Amino acid sequence: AVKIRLTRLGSKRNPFYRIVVADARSPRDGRIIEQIGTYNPTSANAPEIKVDEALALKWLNDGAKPTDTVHNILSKEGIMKKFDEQKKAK
Template identity: 55%
Template sequence: MAVRIRLARFGRKKRPFYRLVVADARAPRDGMYIEQIGTYNPMTDPAEINVKEDRALHWLFNGAQPSETAKALFVKTGVWEKFLSGKKQ
């Protein structure tokens, strides 16, 4: 099973709110997911990003592939740097 870390959209029309989820790559965008590992609210200034670092690193080290947007959020929060430094050891 291919596992992806991606965003699931919630919120009402023109007021998006996203959950950072770990899901099967074949599942629909807002469908079932394995685990929620964070949130992203682009409507606040600055955008609010919450990531459960330990769970995100767990999934990354176990082979989950982040989407481009999820990877950008990991870079902003510093999770991606910790993943790369842990991977080199």
């Protein structure tokens, strides 16, 4: 029931999604636990992103169903290569 996910923050037309960990019960645009990373689907194509990639693995190691739109970009950063490189390690 914990899912890293997206919280759009922009105004009308220029959205700026934020990556963030959360429990699915909550609203989207409301309460969270901790920010990590970010996203910007325009002002540069491909997008402009950051990532924690230090403690972002923490939340996966103890539970998450990270969604696909995220899963894509984590692949674009490739941190999941370390994730499975430990999980399907053993």
